[PDB]
Structure formats: C-alpha cells, structure tokens
Design an enzyme around this catalytic site. Structure first.
Site, PDB file in Angstrom:
ATOM      1  N   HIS A 296     -19.146  25.772 -29.174  1.00 33.45           N
ATOM      2  CA  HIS A 296     -19.600  24.713 -28.270  1.00 33.45           C
ATOM      3  C   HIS A 296     -18.672  24.590 -27.069  1.00 33.45           C
ATOM      4  CE1 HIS A 296     -22.527  23.516 -31.274  1.00 33.45           C
ATOM      5  NE2 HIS A 296     -22.841  22.403 -30.636  1.00 33.45           N
TER       6      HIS A 296
ATOM      7  N   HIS B  65     -14.048  21.276 -35.552  1.00 33.79           N
ATOM      8  CA  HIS B  65     -13.136  22.221 -34.943  1.00 33.79           C
ATOM      9  C   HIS B  65     -11.760  21.590 -34.875  1.00 33.79           C
ATOM     10  CE1 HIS B  65     -15.852  25.461 -33.884  1.00 33.79           C
ATOM     11  NE2 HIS B  65     -16.669  24.628 -33.267  1.00 33.79           N
TER      12      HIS B  65
END
Ligand SMILES: CCCCCCCC/C=C\CCCCCCCC(=O)OC[C@H](O)CO
Ligand SMILES: CCCCCCCC/C=C\CCCCCCCC(=O)OC[C@H](O)CO
Ligand SMILES: CCCCCCCC/C=C\CCCCCCCC(=O)OC[C@H](O)CO
Ligand SMILES: CCCCCCCC/C=C\CCCCCCCC(=O)OC[C@H](O)CO
Ligand SMILES: CCCCCCCC/C=C\CCCCCCCC(=O)OC[C@H](O)CO
Length: 201
Positions: A121, A171
């Site tokens: 992303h 993440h």
C-alpha cells in the site's frame, strides 16, 4: 542522479537493518504504541484512508485519469502511468517473496495474505499519487500556479496511507518506509524519462 539513487540506497540499508534485533524491537514498540491511540471511530476512518493505497482502488483510478487525459488532451500518458504501476506491483511482489518478513500480528484490523516487507500500500501510494500529480500538472493548464499544492496533496495522501498501515497493525514502520522509498524511486524514474523525451521544454 541524486534523488533516485539516494532512495535506492536507503532501501538497501533498510532491507539490511530489519534483520537487526535493535530495529525489530523498535518496530515492535512503535506498532504496539500505535494501538494505544486507537478508537473505533478512528479505526473506520483509517480503514477508509488505507483503501486509497489499495491496488484494487488504484488500477481503476489510473485507468479513469488516463482516459480523462486522453479525451481532454489526446495524450497516451495514461499508458506510462499503467506501466509504472505494474512495474511497482511486480517489484513489491518479488521483494516480498525474496525477503519473507513475518507480519506484526499483534493486533491487525485488516486482512493480509502476504509477507510484510516492503509495504505494498505504501509502495503503491508513494508511486501512483506523485505520478498522477506529475501528469495532471503536465496536462491540465488550470493546475498551473497550483503545482505545489497538487504535489502536497499527493504527499499527504501517501503519508496517510503509510500511517494507516502501521495504525491498522498490518505493517511495521520500516515496511512502510521501505515501500515509500521504492515507490518514490519509480516516480522519479518515470518523471525523469517523460521529461527527457520532450521535444520542447
Ligand atoms: C538519502 C540518504 C543518502 C542515501 C541513503 C543512505 C543513507 C540513508 C540514511 C539513513 C538510513 C537509516 C535506515 C533506517 C533504519 C535504521 C538503521 C539503524 O539505525 O540500524 C542500527 C543498528 O541496527 C544498530 O544495531
Ligand atoms: C552505506 C551506503 C550504501 C549501502 C549499500 C549496502 C547497505 C545494505 C547492505 C546490503 C543490502 C542488501 C540487503 C540484503 C539483506 C542482508 C541481511 C540478510 O539477508 O540477513 C539474512 C540472514 O539469514 C540473517 O539471518
Ligand atoms: C480532465 C480529465 C483528466 C482527469 C480525470 C478526471 C477524473 C479524475 C478525478 C477524480 C477521479 C475519481 C475516481 C474515483 C476512483 C474510482 C476507483 C474505483 O473504481 O474503486 C474500485 C473499488 O475500490 C474496487 O475495490
Ligand atoms: C504500458 C502498457 C500499459 C500497461 C502495462 C501493464 C499494466 C500493468 C497492469 C497492472 C498490474 C496490477 O494491477 O497488479 C495486480 C495487483 O498487484 C493485485 O495483485
Ligand atoms: C530514464 C529512465 C528509463 C526508464 C524509462 C521508463 C520509466 C520507468 C517506468 C516504468 C518502467 C517500465 C517497465 C515495465 C514493466 C511492466 C511490469 C508489469 O506490468 O507487471 C505487472 C505486475 O507484475 C503485476 O503483478
């Protein structure tokens, strides 16, 4: 040249540093500290923000903007945008499967089905939104004299997408910085190419 080489060197140093216990420990501490700021309303907002970095959102976005630019100015630059996006997705996938970093898995708020480093992303957003900014400013004369604001918006969006991956617990910060640096690298490469091939300044 200076900016894409610095980003490439920064990624290599990060790809090494994530194997140190000192960075892994700091990554864990920041990941868990982000949980402390969570609220359910903010969970929803951050999930909405994170979709701006999803490849399922960016592929139709690029196609729409490229189609718009074709009708407006007869440019094919949307093909360049798709190419750099595809390059971006391919590079992220290859690096992820080579590096095989385990996800945080303390408190994810969204689903994931891949390794952690680099963040896709963040890599998508740091590439596509500056690229969109470049081609919008190139082709939309009414965006002249707003160029700094267009790029600031692209930077704010990318930063927010990266923040959201850490907030949502899928993440580590270093995954985000790693993806930032390589998406930005691909942006500078495609911008430098497009400017180099111009026949008038
Ligand atoms: C753009 C700069 C020129 C080109 C790029 C080269 C320099 C990149 C600068 C900093 C890298 C920091 C990486 C962030 C991760 C921290 C690494 C670290 O500090 O490791 C400590 C060590 O693990 C203790 O045991
Ligand atoms: C100083 C400015 C220039 C910097 C240029 C080089 C700096 C980064 C070094 C190598 C990059 C490649 C990273 C490859 C990852 C190495 C760490 C690793 O692979 O560790 C695996 C091992 O199994 C552990 O258990
Ligand atoms: C002058 C012409 C050139 C400029 C172009 C004019 C329009 C560009 C501005 C906004 C686009 C907004 C489009 C919203 C993006 C839609 C993405 C989408 O379809 O999402 C799929 C979904 O996420 C599946 O998971
Ligand atoms: C220049 C020619 C135009 C496009 C080149 C190829 C376009 C690349 C198509 C995008 C690839 C893509 O969206 O990847 C899937 C995504 O990563 C989810 O797994
Ligand atoms: C002067 C600099 C020279 C560089 C000049 C070009 C600017 C760089 C932009 C794109 C690279 C094009 C490479 C095209 C590779 C496409 C890969 C692809 O589409 O794969 C989809 C992906 O794998 C789905 O998973």
């Amino acid at each position: 040249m200076y900016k894409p080489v610095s980003l490439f060197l920064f990624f290599l140093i990060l790809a090494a540093a994530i194997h140190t216990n000192a960075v892994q420990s700091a990554d864990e501490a920041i990941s868990k500290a982000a949980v402390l700021i969570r609220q359910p309303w903010l969970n929803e907002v951050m999930t909405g923000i994170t979709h701006l970095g999803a490849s399922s959102f960016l592929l139709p976005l690029i196609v729409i903007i490229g189609a718009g630019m074709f009708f407006y100015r007869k440019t094919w630059d949307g093909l360049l945008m798709l190419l750099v996006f595809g390059t971006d997705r391919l590079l992220n996938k290859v690096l992820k499967e080579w590096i095989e970093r385990v996800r945080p898995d303390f408190a994810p708020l969204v689903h994931e089905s891949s390794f952690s480093f680099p963040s896709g992303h963040s890599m998508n957003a740091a590439c596509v939104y500056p690229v969109i900014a470049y081609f919008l400013v190139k082709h939309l004369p009414f965006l002249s004299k707003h160029k700094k604001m267009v790029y600031i918006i692209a930077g704010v969006i990318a930063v927010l997408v990266g923040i959201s991956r850490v907030y949502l617990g899928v993440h580590f910060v270093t995954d985000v910085l790693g993806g930032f640096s390589l998406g930005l690298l691909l942006f500078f490469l495609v911008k430098g190419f497009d400017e180099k091939i111009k026949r008038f300044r």
